[PDB]
Design a protein around this ligand. Sequence first.
Ligand SMILES: *[C@@H]1O[C@H](CO)[C@@H](O[C@@H]2O[C@H](CO)[C@@H](O)[C@H](O)[C@H]2NC(C)=O)[C@H](O)[C@H]1NC(C)=O
Ligand SMILES: *[C@@H]1O[C@H](CO)[C@@H](O)[C@H](O)[C@H]1NC(C)=O
Ligand SMILES: *[C@@H]1O[C@H](CO)[C@@H](O)[C@H](O)[C@H]1NC(C)=O
Lengths: 273, 96
Amino acid sequence: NYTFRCLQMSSFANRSWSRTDSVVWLGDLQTHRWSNDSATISFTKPWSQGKLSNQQWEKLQHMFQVYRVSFTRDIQELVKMMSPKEDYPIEIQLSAGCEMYPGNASESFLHVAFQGKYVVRFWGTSWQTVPGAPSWLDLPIKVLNADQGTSATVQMLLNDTCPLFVRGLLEAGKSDLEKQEKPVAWLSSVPSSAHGHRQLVCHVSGFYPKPVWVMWMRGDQEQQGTHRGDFLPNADETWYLQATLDVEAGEEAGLACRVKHSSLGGQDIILYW
Amino acid sequence: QKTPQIQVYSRHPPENGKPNILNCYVTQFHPPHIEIQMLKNGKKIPKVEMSDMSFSKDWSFYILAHTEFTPTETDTYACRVKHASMAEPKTVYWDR
Ligand SMILES: *[C@@H]1O[C@H](CO)[C@@H](O[C@@H]2O[C@H](CO)[C@@H](O)[C@H](O)[C@H]2NC(C)=O)[C@H](O)[C@H]1NC(C)=O
Ligand SMILES: *[C@@H]1O[C@H](CO)[C@@H](O)[C@H](O)[C@H]1NC(C)=O
Ligand SMILES: *[C@@H]1O[C@H](CO)[C@@H](O)[C@H](O)[C@H]1NC(C)=O
């Protein structure tokens, strides 16, 4: 069950300055980057072309190159059409791709945000503003829905190309996507926000894939004061997480941190304070 | 407009005099234009790798800075961020 998402980030600071950068993710692994500085899209995996031939990839890349130049001039022309309602600086974000289900099923999506807020999506055969989007967008969106060539292209990309490409990626990227990296854990303490307390910290790092279990324990008793933090990425495509427990002074003895992960195969790590 | 959160953590358990990597993960910010510096005893560390900028389901941006370091007993490390949502730079120290 994977989500393929191509993310575009476009910044317009004035009539003469703009950059557009993209990244592509298949689940939590980066497959592509496309900096404003490069003509060509760059691979960040050996399998980033999926099962597409060089002919098919060039054709797909070519369309995105056209799109990026056209996007940039279209938006800057749209600034002058609705100025000075909303002036520079302008940030636009696109998130497009598909969710891959079992039995060869998928749902595709194309979402757009303006100034960090969701405003437009592609849906079915047309672009549409979302409820509560600013009303100055209604005319530009009509202008764009009149471009039936763009509409057919986007419909092809969402219905055919996106799930096609991703089926290929999953095959060609099997050994990376199914990789198992083992967590290493360690214990420390930091000051608590409460008096007479110490914050015990169980760190867990280098594990892949993401799902993990970490609990402070006193024997078989789970310590319900265990505060699990967020998953924080390491730079080597593994995950980091820490779980904390604020404890009174003197009450530290007997505590243990216990870690379960699919790469350990039942052999939990258990550290004792 | 949105204020960056900053988290600082090592890749491996820190042993003094053993090579390690120090990460600085900056999240929840908007707009994408940002300066991230990693600091050793208050001076900027020159060779710092940055990931590509990306964003979450909620549209907020994130980015990972990391650098090679080998900890000692007396060296202190931090990550400082300049961003337009903050009149002052925000500094977060590595916990140890
Ligand atoms: C791409 O898929 C969408 C389904 O999401 C198709 O849009 C639907 O088309 C049907 C039949 O033509 C309409 O009755 C529906 O109203 C459309 N769906 C929605 C949600 O509006 C679209 O035609 C497909 N395009 C291609 C080229 O295959
Ligand atoms: C446009 O914006 C860029 C980047 O913020 C800036 O360096 C440049 O001086 C600006 N130019 C004009 C003409 O406003
Ligand atoms: C982004 O790329 C375009 C097209 O190549 C270029 O002309 C533009 O100046 C670039 N912007 C920046 C800020 O480098």
